[PDB]
């Protein structure tokens, strides 16, 4: 391409002539040193570049090269189990090459490995009429996930030559004669981060996702292709919640994005995450994970790009038909990069210094995730389920980022550090928190469990909300101020609080709980509910009901420790209630 | 077609060497790769034309691109087959059927109704909701909005009014124009579900605009629907009703564009012209002398942080002919829909009450139920302030009345229709709880008629 | 280059210049012969506009020359830096030896690779009971101190500099101390205190005064931090950076931004504030494969005591917690006046407990927090009416918080408490309550 010329360097703003071929948002290698930059505005041939790196020592006369594309990512073999920043720089690789612990100015390195040999295995025969999103072969990439090589968007023709063999992601692997002529297909494809990947159709995410975590799967569930937002107050075991989702969830891959977190706090994600063990294989969770890392120290473009690069990757795996989970923490630091970006662009500010198009950026992001039909003849169904942390400065609701996230996303798990002080883990506030998929999950859950699950969950919610009703009254006067009818109900909910809601991420059995086990534990406390209410109504008194049932209620405390193999262990609680209740008829 | 793009600055683009380009004109942009983008002419001066592109100017090469100047502002291709169809904010075949062959193209800004040519809103629309039919009566032609908040069930109510809406004469020429402004794909799909489940589709045009759709498409959305609405109301001559969701989502887009154009932000961050811009939308509602069939509008807005003195609800309030309020306190009690009738009001209500349109008694029942429910709330107030013994026997009954008024009267569920007759019948029934002496707001002859 | 075209306030416009660069150092030979240094704030084809450190007063444009030095602001790094006092640009203000530098480094440095960081490991005993116990500092952390005008942050600063040590390593911190735009009486307090205690032998000092140029103020934190990273990551020393007062840096930053005709973002500070602050603050931590480390205690005053003010707000997001100093406490005579309610260390969990400090560390800290919580809640509800609104249990809480604030936190700026002593006095302050109000099962561990 044409080499441009610096004509002005004012702070982080660079002017350059000859930039007549470049487009808007095209990424640039500004100056001799060749630092990263983006074309913001053009006048004639003069381009105006935002440079996101120390511009010191850059003067006029120096060259400016365009990469020839907007911010993109390289997609292909060598992408899973990798650690990138928001602009997809290989952090491992960077060290080995620079022989340095520091991110040097204007050093440029290919995102993936262009020199790694892979076994490309052809799965489509020559003379095949192809279109975008069609599978031409596969690479067994990790110990878990199989990389399905796909037809890039734009190409449509016929396969002339296809062989199985060992090639780099730079070697041609295919020859397709299009309406233009010969176009060789390679192992990697590229894609602008800010533009969402095409799909055949968007469908309602209706399939709930098994997260194993009780309070979530039961009361505030997210479907495969749904979105949830989490406050991040300190000491509320947020990382623990994140990790549990990251492993127990029946998604094929995990994409984690660190937007722009505290240095030492960012290192915790780097250390902890690889040491997560995949529940099913026993292999490292990395083998099905792409991770993005960004200190606040990182170039603002990278901090802003963070969630976009993340979801662009998340989409490229969705097109393969997999279920993907995208986690970002926090999206507040991201929004904080947008705010700075807005400031540097001299725009009219929106609310509290954020750009006026903040809600639009969020909608642009959270609507790229869902249940889809990918391109290609197969009409395969993929999905991206989005999990986003928010850290609202002084931990607040009012703040715009939170409010706009909550305006477009469906599920809200509200972590509360007062419930963490009470030693209630996971720390989700059962009153504040909510899921819109609730009444939709009833449809799918009653169908697949042949039971009245929806009738059970929404009843438990009448009980837990009525607990807070009574806890306002109990704290108001004394205790005896309630007749046995209220006094029963206060313990029923306490049984839910300690025997169903409280779940330990570390205990070999309690760490995960499937559908049946969940259904059961939910029922066997609900079986206690109706039975004792009929007991109290016909003369029998509060104290009588309680002091003696201790044999089963201290065995109800154990429900969360029964192995999955031992199904009928809890199912047999439905019997011991009907007997001990009959003992109080004597 | 001009191949002379001089500047791009953000979403704004400057094209020189042009001729006879008009303000507000539509453009299209042919990019060097082949992509096509719609746009507006903001400001034209000399041989220059400054334009804003809807889908943004992202990834455009200036040298190797071109602009086509359509010679006409925003336009909707209108046809009577639009019924049962779904279009986007720009009004294109979104539902996959046979492509529409439009009778004509109307500019979406339409035109102002001559005040003398204007016919005053008269008669009655059966909404299906007691709190709107009886105490804040919607009258064909009127503007009557819904005042809400986040997570409140306005979406449920929008879906309900669209179904239960119909006239009390020839129901045959009744239609409903529904506009989705900046809502999520799953919010859209919900409305697609309730429409193709009860078949309200078979009498409705739909304009589905999304949260991630370009902001300028969000602005256009209501103007398309209203162009579609006036066309069906005068041209085809139908009593047309218009529903538009999250007016707040409209304003969010308005201030977003306003800021993109570097416009001076008015009160609370919204543009100084917020009042007027909304008026070019709401005043489109009404009737015309001699022309059979009318346009009535039901806009929906979520009040930011429940604040009524916020620009959105306030400036809408300053335009519309009344308001319908949905409160947290009533949705908290499980009342569906959560309509607080105390802060609500329909101004032109008296033009859809009395014999012929509804029933002769309408007037007294409305004004007795209010005067009572008010005092019943004042009683409910001192009930747990100075103990429930401080309010006497005269007070106590009224408090029991307000209690049955919400549970049984205002609450009716989002899936059970109520006709005015049923509304009046149930209305008198709740009223029965009071002695004939305390029922002073009603004269004698209206009383002896209702068991 | 004799082509001075314009002078507008501090700024100066040099034309027809050749191959200049942004943030390059210059010299101005005036027609009288006096020399003034400067920095390029902008460059164009023909022209290049600069700002003169000293100021612009008394310069004849015609007969004055401009020399372009070719390089940005540099620090000459050496190991003879320990025990020396420099200005905000690195020139010596102590009249000692020569200080011939091993090499010259750019003062901006380079971002630490996010996967090259190492978890902050070892406990730093500051000698301060509100830190070491309730808001524990860990080597490689960034733990700032939020304060206000006319508060004893000055004192605290010098304390942490003199007292802070890591447990059993015979390693002393090298202390890099930077003062940004402080008064004389303020700067003299410091330099005296370091000389009065032998603290200067362990320290390299960067001393910037309030009446120093605004451009020098901005340089100082970067100057000090370049010397830190040097000693730590090239000489393998455990370094503790203390810098005051960051508000004065940000204030100086506004001065140049407004000079470069830049439109400010939120609250009149530049849009690029966050980056600028992160750029400085994230020059700290341990590095995987390297012996030395940089720990960081930044100090700032909160304008009008506003928490949501950009300077303490943006610093919040960047650093792992913060230490708060309230007027309410200092006026009660609390030394040091640390309010532990809003105060936090986000990393305290990394270096506390068995073999790190002592077993009881967590429990006491959590038990002291919720006891002091209701303690200040009983005191604000004691002014509702007393004693008709204080119960048998409530009385012991206002009695707890008073002795907590006076005897526990209020230790005096020259009292150096060990972790042994801090937990013991904490146990004995907790002993004011019955064993029912909870603290592990073996709570009789200390009585």
């Amino acid at each position: 391409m044409q080499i441009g010329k610096i004509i002005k360097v004012s702070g982080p703003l660079v002017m350059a002539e000859n930039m007549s071929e470049a487009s808007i948002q095209d990424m640039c290698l500004v100056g001799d040193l060749g630092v990263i930059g983006e074309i913001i505005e053009m006048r004639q041939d003069v381009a105006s570049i935002q440079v996101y790196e120390e511009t010191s020592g850059i003067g006029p006369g120096e060259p400016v090269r365009s990469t020839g594309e907007a911010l993109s990512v390289e997609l292909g073999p060598g992408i899973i189990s990798q650690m990138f920043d928001g602009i997809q720089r290989p952090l491992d690789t960077f060290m080995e090459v620079t022989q340095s612990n520091f991110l040097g100015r204007g050093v440029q390195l290919p995102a993936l490995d262009h020199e790694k040999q892979w076994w490309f295995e052809a799965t489509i025969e020559e003379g095949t009429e192809v279109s975008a999103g069609d599978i031409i072969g596969y690479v067994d990439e990790t110990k878990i996930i199989q990389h399905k090589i796909m037809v890039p968007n734009g190409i449509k023709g016929t396969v002339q030559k296809i062989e199985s063999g060992s090639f780099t992601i730079d070697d041609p692997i295919c020859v397709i004669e299009t309406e233009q002529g010969l176009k060789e297909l390679t192992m990697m494809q590229k894609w602008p981060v800010r533009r969402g990947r095409p799909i055949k159709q968007k469908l309602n995410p209706d399939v709930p996702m098994i997260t194993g975590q009780r309070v979530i799967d039961t009361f505030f569930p997210v479907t495969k292709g749904g979105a949830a937002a989490v406050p991040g107050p300190f000491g509320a075991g947020k990382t623990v919640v994140q990790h549990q989702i990251a492993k127990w969830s029946d998604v094929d891959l995990v994409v984690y994005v660190g937007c722009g977190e505290r240095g030492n706090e960012m290192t915790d994600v780097v250390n902890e995450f690889p040491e997560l063990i995949d529940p099913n294989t026993g292999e490292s969770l990395m083998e099905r994970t792409v991770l993005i890392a960004n200190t606040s120290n990182m170039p603002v473009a990278a901090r802003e790009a963070s969630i976009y690069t993340g979801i662009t990757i998340a989409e490229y795996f969705r097109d393969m038909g997999y279920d993907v989970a995208i986690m970002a923490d926090s999206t507040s630091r991201w929004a904080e990069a947008l705010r700075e970006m807005s400031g540097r662009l001299e725009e009219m500010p929106g609310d509290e210094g954020y750009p006026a198009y903040l809600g639009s950026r969020l909608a642009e992001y959270y609507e790229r995730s869902g249940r889809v039909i990918a391109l290609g003849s197969d009409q395969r169904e993929g999905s991206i389920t989005a999990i986003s942390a928010v850290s609202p400065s002084g931990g607040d609701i009012s703040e715009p980022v939170t409010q706009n996230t909550l305006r477009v996303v469906k599920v809200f798990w509200g972590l509360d550090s007062s419930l963490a002080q009470k030693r209630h883990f996971p720390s989700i506030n059962w009153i504040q928190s909510y899921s819109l998929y609730s009444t939709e999950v009833g449809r799918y859950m009653d169908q697949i469990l042949q039971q009245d699950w929806s009738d059970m969950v929404t009843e438990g919610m009448r009980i837990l909300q009525e607990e807070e009703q009574l806890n306002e009254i109990v704290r108001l006067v004394g205790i005896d101020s309630l007749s046995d009818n209220d006094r029963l109900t206060l313990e029923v909910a306490k049984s839910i609080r300690e025997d169903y809601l409280q779940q330990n991420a570390f205990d070999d059995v309690d760490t995960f709980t499937s559908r049946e086990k969940q259904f059961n534990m939910l029922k066997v406390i609900l079986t206690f509910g109706k039975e004792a209410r009929k007991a109290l109504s016909l003369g029998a008194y509060f104290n009588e009901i309680m002091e003696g049932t201790v044999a089963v209620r201290e065995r109800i405390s154990r429900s969360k420790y029964i192995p999955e193999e031992e199904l009928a262990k809890i199912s047999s609680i439905n019997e011991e209630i009907k007997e001990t209740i009959q003992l109080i008829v004597s | 077609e001009y191949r002379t793009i001089k500047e791009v600055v953000g979403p704004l683009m400057a094209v020189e060497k042009v001729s006879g380009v008009k303000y507000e004109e539509l453009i299209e942009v042919r990019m060097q790769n082949g992509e096509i983008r719609r746009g507006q002419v903001l400001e034209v001066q000399e041989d220059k034309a400054m334009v804003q592109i809807f889908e943004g100017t992202s990834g455009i090469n200036l040298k190797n691109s071109s602009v086509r100047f359509l010679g006409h502002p925003l336009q909707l291709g209108v046809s009577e087959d639009m019924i049962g169809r779904v279009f986007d904010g720009l009004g294109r075949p979104k539902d996959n059927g046979p492509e529409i062959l439009p009778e004509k193209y109307l500019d979406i800004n339409g035109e102002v109704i001559n005040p003398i040519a204007r016919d005053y809103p008269d008669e009655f629309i059966q909404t299906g909701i007691s709190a709107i039919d009886h105490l804040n009566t919607l009258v064909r032609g009127q503007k009557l909005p819904v005042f809400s908040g986040s997570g409140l069930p306005h979406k449920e109510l929008a879906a309900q009014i669209a179904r239960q809406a119909t006239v009390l004469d020839s129901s045959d020429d009744f239609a409903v124009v529904f506009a989705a402004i900046g809502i999520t794909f799953e919010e859209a799909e919900f409305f697609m579900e309730d429409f193709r489940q009860t078949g309200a589709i078979d009498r409705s045009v739909m304009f589905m605009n999304l949260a991630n759709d370009p902001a300028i498409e969000r602005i256009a959305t209501p103007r398309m629907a209203l162009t579609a609405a006036e066309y069906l109301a005068y041209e085809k001559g139908m009593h047309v009703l218009v529903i538009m969701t999250d007016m707040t989502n409209y304003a969010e887009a308005l201030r977003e564009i306003s800021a993109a154009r570097r416009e001076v932000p008015g009160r609370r961050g919204y543009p100084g012209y917020l009042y007027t811009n909304l008026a070019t939308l709401f005043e489109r509602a009404g009737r015309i002398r001699g022309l059979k069939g009318s346009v009535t509008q039901i806009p929906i807005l979520t009040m930011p942080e429940d604040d009524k003195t916020h620009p959105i609800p306030d400036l809408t309030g300053y335009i519309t002919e009344g308001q319908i309020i949905l409160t947290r306190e009533l949705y908290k009690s499980g009342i569906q829909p959560p309509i607080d009738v105390l802060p609500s009001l329909s101004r032109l209500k008296d033009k859809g009450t009395g014999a012929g349109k509804t029933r002769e008694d309408h007037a007294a029942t409305m004004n007795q139920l209010f005067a009572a429910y008010a005092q019943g709330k004042q009683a409910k107030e001192l009930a747990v302030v100075l103990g429930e013994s401080a309010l006497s026997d005269i007070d106590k009954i009224y408090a029991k009345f307000a209690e049955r008024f919400e549970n049984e009267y205002v609450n009716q569920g989002f899936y059970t229709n109520r006709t005015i007759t049923e509304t009046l019948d149930l209305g008198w029934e709740l009223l029965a709880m009071l002695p004939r002496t305390e029922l002073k707001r009603i004269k004698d002859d209206l009383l002896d008629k209702y068991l």
Side-chain angles (χ1 to χ4, degrees), chain A, chain B residues 1-245 247-390 392-450:
Chain A
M1 183 170 288
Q2 152 108 122
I3 287 158
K5 197 190 182 191
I6 303 254
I7 65 165
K8 174 182 190 163
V9 201
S10 193
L13 184 83
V14 158
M15 306 278 97
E17 54 190 27
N18 281 312
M19 310 298 314
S20 45
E21 308 79 355
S23 289
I24 305 299
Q25 326 284 346
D26 266 33
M27 296 290 148
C28 300
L29 283 77
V30 182
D32 271 309
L33 220 35
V35 282
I36 330 147
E38 175 183 54
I39 283 163
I40 297 298
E41 57 202 49
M42 188 93 67
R43 299 173 177 75
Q44 313 266 127
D45 69 307
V46 192
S48 305
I49 310 150
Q50 276 295 315
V51 182
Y52 316 98
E53 222 149 340
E54 271 308 310
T55 48
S56 176
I58 298 175
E62 292 178 58
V64 173
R65 299 175 163 87
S66 181
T67 57
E69 54 174 40
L71 196 59
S72 299
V73 282
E74 306 192 345
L75 305 166
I79 202 168
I80 314 171
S81 300
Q82 279 291 132
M83 292 185 158
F84 300 113
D85 62 5
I87 59 174
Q88 200 202 28
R89 293 194 284 170
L91 297 164
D92 334 68
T93 314
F94 222 101
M95 306 215 314
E96 300 146 29
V97 193
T98 39
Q99 275 300 293
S100 167
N101 296 301
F102 303 116
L103 267 36
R105 254 180 246 73
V107 161
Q108 304 285 1
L109 285 181
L112 308 184
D113 201 312
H114 294 205
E115 297 148 345
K116 180 162 186 155
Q117 299 279 6
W118 296 83
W119 186 252
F120 168 51
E121 179 74 22
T123 53
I124 216 158
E125 247 78 70
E126 291 171 30
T128 302
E129 37 284 285
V130 279
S131 53
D134 267 333
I135 329 154
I136 78 143
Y138 81 83
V139 195
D140 288 320
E141 190 190 328
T142 60
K143 254 93 176 186
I144 314 171
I145 304 291
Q146 167 193 299
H147 202 74
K148 302 167 175 183
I149 311 284
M150 299 182 77
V151 182
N153 287 123
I155 310 277
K156 188 180 175 67
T158 312
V159 183
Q160 302 290 110
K161 291 95 210 306
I162 201 159
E163 255 202 331
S164 302
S166 195
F167 313 105
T168 64
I169 64 155
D170 278 15
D171 288 309
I173 76 178
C174 190
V175 168
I176 288 172
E177 200 214 320
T178 62
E179 303 198 59
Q180 300 145 339
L182 298 179
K183 254 79 171 183
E184 309 177 340
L185 288 192
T186 187
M187 302 223 69
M188 159 233 19
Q189 67 171 72
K190 258 183 286 155
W191 199 252
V193 297
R194 300 268 297 114
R195 185 231 195 127
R197 284 190 76 101
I199 53 154
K200 196 92 211 297
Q201 197 204 317
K202 210 173 208 282
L203 314 138
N204 304 59
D206 64 75
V207 204
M209 178 181 287
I210 278 305
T211 72
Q213 311 313 292
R214 283 198 288 283
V215 46
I216 294 185
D217 280 292
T218 316
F219 277 81
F220 317 107
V222 64
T223 55
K224 306 190 186 176
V230 200
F234 180 70
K238 174 180 55 66
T239 27
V240 196
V241 170
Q242 287 172 22
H243 293 153
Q244 291 295 103
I245 306 304
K247 60 183 194 185
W248 297 120
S249 290
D250 53 323
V251 272
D252 297 300
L253 274 109
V254 178
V255 191
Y256 186 104
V257 181
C259 303
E261 321 301 287
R262 321 190 163 76
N264 301 126
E265 275 192 2
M266 180 61 61
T267 311
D268 255 340
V269 187
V270 158
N271 289 359
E272 282 183 327
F273 226 96
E275 289 193 284
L276 277 167
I277 296 94
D278 184 37
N280 289 346
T281 54
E283 300 279 318
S284 176
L285 217 223
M286 280 303 156
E287 298 288 83
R288 60 180 191 94
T289 302
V290 184
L291 183 134
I292 312 295
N294 281 122
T295 43
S296 50
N297 221 13
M298 298 289 102
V300 67
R303 293 194 256 112
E304 188 214 290
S306 75
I307 72 173
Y308 293 125
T309 284
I311 205 148
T312 298
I313 282 173
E315 276 169 303
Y316 168 78
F317 282 112
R318 181 202 63 194
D319 297 355
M320 278 154 75
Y322 295 115
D323 292 324
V324 204
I326 191 175
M327 317 196 92
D329 193 340
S330 111
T331 61
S332 296
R333 301 289 168 266
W334 168 83
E336 197 56 37
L338 249 191
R339 184 200 266 163
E340 183 190 332
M341 261 325 300
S342 185
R344 286 152 67 123
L345 288 179
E346 299 201 330
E347 323 181 320
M348 307 309 299
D351 284 311
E352 284 191 45
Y354 293 108
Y357 52 89
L358 165 75
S360 283
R361 293 310 187 78
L362 286 178
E364 270 180 23
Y365 173 77
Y366 291 110
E367 289 278 331
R368 286 174 64 169
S369 66
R371 194 170 83 125
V372 309
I373 300 154
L375 304 192
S377 69
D378 317 81
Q379 291 197 21
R380 41 177 161 270
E381 182 196 297
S383 77
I384 296 156
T385 317
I387 318 288
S388 297
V390 286
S391 60
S393 200
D396 213 355
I397 324 300
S398 265
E399 91 107 339
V401 188
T402 297
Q403 300 296 58
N404 278 184
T405 290
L406 285 202
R407 186 208 42 172
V408 313
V409 313
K410 291 184 75 156
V411 194
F412 168 70
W413 309 314
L415 293 184
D416 190 5
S417 51
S418 91
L419 296 176
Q421 282 296 55
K422 291 168 185 168
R423 292 275 324 269
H424 186 110
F425 274 69
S427 287
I428 301 138
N429 192 308
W430 51 96
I431 302 299
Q432 293 176 309
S433 308
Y434 65 85
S435 181
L436 272 52
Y437 291 110
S438 266
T439 332
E440 170 53 52
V441 150
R443 278 190 205 86
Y444 188 90
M445 214 63 65
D446 293 12
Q447 162 68 37
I448 212 158
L449 288 171
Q450 296 295 126
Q451 285 292 331
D452 289 67
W453 198 74
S454 60
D455 281 307
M456 266 172 258
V457 179
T458 49
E459 165 73 39
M461 196 57 100
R462 181 188 68 106
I463 301 299
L464 285 168
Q465 275 181 300
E466 192 159 65
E467 177 184 46
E468 198 200 350
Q469 291 260 73
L470 293 167
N471 270 24
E472 188 61 49
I473 313 160
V474 177
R475 194 213 44 82
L476 248 165
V477 198
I479 176 71
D480 296 14
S481 307
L482 301 178
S483 67
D484 317 311
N485 213 162
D486 295 321
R487 293 290 307 279
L488 150 77
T489 329
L490 281 161
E491 282 289 334
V492 179
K494 192 198 170 178
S495 187
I496 312 167
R497 271 198 279 103
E498 293 189 58
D499 305 326
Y500 196 82
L501 287 166
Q502 284 175 9
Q503 190 172 357
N504 199 293
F506 303 81
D507 184 272
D508 274 44
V509 182
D510 201 27
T511 180
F512 176 96
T513 300
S514 70
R515 258 157 206 182
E516 288 91 293
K517 193 178 163 181
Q518 269 182 54
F519 154 77
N520 289 76
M521 299 162 64
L522 169 66
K523 181 72 196 295
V524 300
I525 308 166
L526 259 152
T527 316
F528 204 110
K530 196 203 149 66
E531 292 287 66
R533 204 186 290 272
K534 198 188 170 184
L536 281 166
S537 66
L538 278 154
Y541 259 85
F542 175 83
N543 283 336
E544 282 185 309
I545 329 285
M546 298 293 93
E547 294 142 47
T549 40
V550 199
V552 68
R553 305 175 317 168
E554 185 75 4
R555 191 206 150 186
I556 283 160
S557 317
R558 287 286 295 169
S559 314
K560 35 182 173 172
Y561 297 89
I562 313 295
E564 303 297 324
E565 289 94 330
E566 295 180 14
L567 186 96
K569 266 287 186 69
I570 307 169
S571 200
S572 60
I573 305 282
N574 287 316
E575 350 279 73
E576 204 191 329
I577 300 158
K578 281 179 159 61
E579 188 225 308
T580 318
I581 279 291
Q582 220 67 26
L583 268 166
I584 316 158
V585 187
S586 306
Chain B
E1 170 173 280
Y2 296 90
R3 288 163 299 279
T4 29
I5 302 167
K6 181 199 181 184
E7 284 178 331
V8 175
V9 170
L12 270 64
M13 183 171 91
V15 182
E16 56 184 1
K17 256 91 173 184
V18 299
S19 313
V21 180
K22 310 296 166 198
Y23 169 77
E24 275 193 19
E25 208 177 307
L26 225 71
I27 60 150
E28 281 181 5
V29 193
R30 160 96 105 159
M31 263 152 292
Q32 75 286 354
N33 53 42
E35 199 192 318
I36 293 296
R37 273 174 202 173
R38 306 270 274 253
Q40 265 201 251
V41 176
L42 307 182
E43 188 205 62
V44 57
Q45 161 205 47
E46 223 82 36
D47 68 295
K48 169 200 152 279
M50 196 214 295
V51 296
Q52 172 188 172
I53 294 96
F54 302 166
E55 306 95 334
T57 69
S58 211
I60 290 175
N61 179 230
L62 280 76
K63 172 178 273 180
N64 294 305
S65 293
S66 66
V67 186
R68 275 204 265 95
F69 287 88
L70 304 212
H72 67 103
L74 235 52
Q75 272 187 336
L76 157 67
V78 283
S79 190
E80 59 171 300
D81 287 336
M82 284 166 62
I83 302 281
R85 303 292 303 245
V86 169
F87 303 104
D88 65 333
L90 297 192
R92 288 169 297 199
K94 211 175 184 280
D95 67 344
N96 289 330
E99 29 83 13
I100 196 87
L101 296 161
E103 181 193 327
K104 62 178 90 174
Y105 289 87
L106 291 165
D107 169 53
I108 56 160
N109 277 130
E111 275 162 308
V112 202
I113 295 160
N114 194 302
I116 280 296
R118 186 188 283 286
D119 218 326
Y120 203 94
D122 201 66
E123 289 158 334
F124 176 78
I125 287 170
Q126 192 169 254
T127 59
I129 292 89
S130 293
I132 315 164
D133 290 313
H134 188 44
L135 279 92
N136 299 306
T137 313
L138 174 80
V139 172
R140 323 166 171 184
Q142 185 175 41
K143 306 163 275 289
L144 204 65
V146 202
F147 280 24
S148 208
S150 252
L152 280 156
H154 51 102
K155 49 202 270 263
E156 280 74 34
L157 184 68
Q160 196 197 19
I161 300 168
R163 301 191 309 269
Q164 306 166 337
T166 181
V167 280
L168 304 195
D169 44 42
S170 301
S171 44
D172 204 18
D173 40 46
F174 187 94
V176 162
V177 175
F178 198 91
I181 302 152
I183 55 163
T184 50
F185 158 76
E186 288 184 51
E187 266 194 279
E189 274 304 312
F190 159 76
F191 283 124
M192 304 281 272
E193 172 56 48
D194 195 84
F195 268 62
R196 291 194 288 257
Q197 161 63 23
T198 46
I201 183 82
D202 302 337
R203 65 203 41 84
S204 305
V205 188
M206 284 164 86
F207 293 96
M208 298 301 104
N209 178 272
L210 303 183
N212 63 334
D213 268 352
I216 318 80
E217 293 194 30
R218 312 217 272 270
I219 294 299
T221 308
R223 261 170 278 268
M224 293 271 316
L226 286 164
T227 299
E230 284 165 313
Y231 170 87
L232 287 171
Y234 314 128
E235 280 264 332
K236 288 294 179 301
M238 307 181 83
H239 276 101
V240 177
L241 180 73
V242 170
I243 319 289
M244 295 164 161
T245 183
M247 280 308 98
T248 310
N249 278 349
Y250 177 83
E252 188 192 320
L254 184 66
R255 69 181 291 196
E256 181 184 314
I257 291 317
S258 179
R261 291 158 182 199
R262 320 193 58 77
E263 295 177 3
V264 212
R267 192 176 172 269
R268 304 265 221 109
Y270 293 85
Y273 55 85
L274 179 55
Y275 177 84
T276 315
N277 191 273
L278 281 168
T280 70
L281 297 173
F282 294 131
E283 280 286 290
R284 302 267 293 258
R287 298 183 56 215
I288 286 172
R289 289 184 201 272
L291 264 162
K292 222 153 171 292
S294 73
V295 175
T296 324
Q297 282 194 58
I298 307 175
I300 302 151
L301 54 88
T302 54
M303 301 197 291
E305 301 203 55
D306 296 359
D307 192 13
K308 199 196 287 191
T309 71
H310 190 271
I312 324 283
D314 194 57
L315 290 176
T316 297
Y318 271 136
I319 296 169
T320 67
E321 289 144 335
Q323 66 278 350
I324 296 294
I325 318 281
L326 297 167
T327 27
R328 288 270 135 75
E329 297 88 287
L330 295 188
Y331 168 76
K332 168 188 151 64
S333 292
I335 311 301
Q336 295 174 124
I339 306 175
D340 192 1
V341 287
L342 278 150
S344 290
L345 191 54
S346 184
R347 296 188 194 183
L348 333 166
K349 56 184 171 292
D350 329 71
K351 302 284 283 178
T353 69
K357 304 164 181 75
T358 48
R359 207 198 283 158
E360 50 216 0
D361 60 345
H362 205 315
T365 25
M366 178 193 72
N367 284 139
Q368 190 78 85
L369 281 157
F370 194 87
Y373 172 72
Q375 201 186 343
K377 272 303 293 170
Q378 194 196 332
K380 273 263 186 172
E381 170 59 48
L382 205 66
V384 203
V385 155
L386 277 157
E388 210 182 320
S389 66
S392 65
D393 265 358
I394 302 163
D395 311 349
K396 270 182 167 67
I397 326 154
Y398 274 104
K400 186 74 185 165
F401 168 78
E403 189 186 72
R404 272 188 54 190
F405 185 88
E406 297 176 10
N407 292 313
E408 303 173 21
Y409 191 66
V410 189
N411 172 42
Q412 59 173 65
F414 301 118
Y415 281 102
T416 40
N417 188 350
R418 289 184 176 182
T419 54
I420 178 68
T421 305
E422 281 189 350
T423 302
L424 299 165
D425 300 337
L426 204 76
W428 281 109
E429 281 174 331
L430 308 152
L431 277 161
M433 306 160 73
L434 282 162
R436 197 182 186 166
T437 178
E438 285 280 75
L439 280 139
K440 113 152 209 285
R441 269 278 326 115
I442 309 163
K443 266 278 160 65
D444 305 298
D445 66 336
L446 287 162
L447 298 159
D448 294 303
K449 201 170 180 173
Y450 304 94

